[PDB]
Design a protein around this ligand. Structure first.
Ligand SMILES: Cc1nnn(C2CCN(CCN(C)C)CC2)c1-c1cccc(Oc2cc(Br)ccc2Br)n1
Ligand SMILES: [Cl-]
Ligand SMILES: [Cl-]
Length: 126
């Protein structure tokens, strides 16, 4: 069975809108989401429908761009580092579960390269 998705709403959690988080939504997330390789990463892994009974035995910190998108749109984060960590968790999970040269890994690698290019221009906090 699938676990509940990562949290995207939590009223008592401290949270902010910073200019860096706005950049992560308007530039970084937007760039990755439109890419031809984004689709596997646009929602949590459905281990039931993909017939992956081992996925959530192996991946204990799941993350995906649908969750990140909801977090950014709901202003769930305190800082940019927390969101950057979510992206890095997503990529790392893909590399942990899959094998070098798999199609999904080639896709994650292309998205990660673009991610790195965009976060190099993360603005100074205003
Ligand atoms: C994210 C993410 N991380 N890992 N995976 C799967 C894990 C299982 N793998 C099976 C084949 N291995 C054993 C060689 C495929 C990749 C996904 C994911 C998420 C949503 C859909 C999706 O569908 C596929 C995408 C591609 Br490209 C290729 C096949 C499918 Br099915 N994959
Ligand atoms: Cl399953
Ligand atoms: Cl493959």
């Amino acid at each position: 069975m699938n676990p509940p998705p990562p949290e995207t709403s939590n009223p008592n959690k401290p949270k902010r809108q910073t200019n860096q988080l706005q950049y992560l939504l308007r530039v970084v997330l937007k760039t990755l989401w439109k890419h031809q390789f984004a689709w596997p990463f646009q929602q949590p892994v459905d281990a039931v429908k993909l017939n992956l009974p081992d996925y959530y035995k192996i991946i204990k910190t799941p993350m995906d761009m649908g969750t990140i998108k909801k977090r950014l749109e709901n202003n769930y984060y305190w800082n940019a580092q927390e969101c950057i960590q979510d992206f890095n968790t997503m990529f790392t999970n893909c590399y942990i579960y899959n094998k070098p040269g798999d199609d999904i890994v080639l896709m994650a690698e292309a998205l990660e390269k673009l991610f790195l290019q965009k976060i190099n221009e993360l603005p100074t906090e205003e």
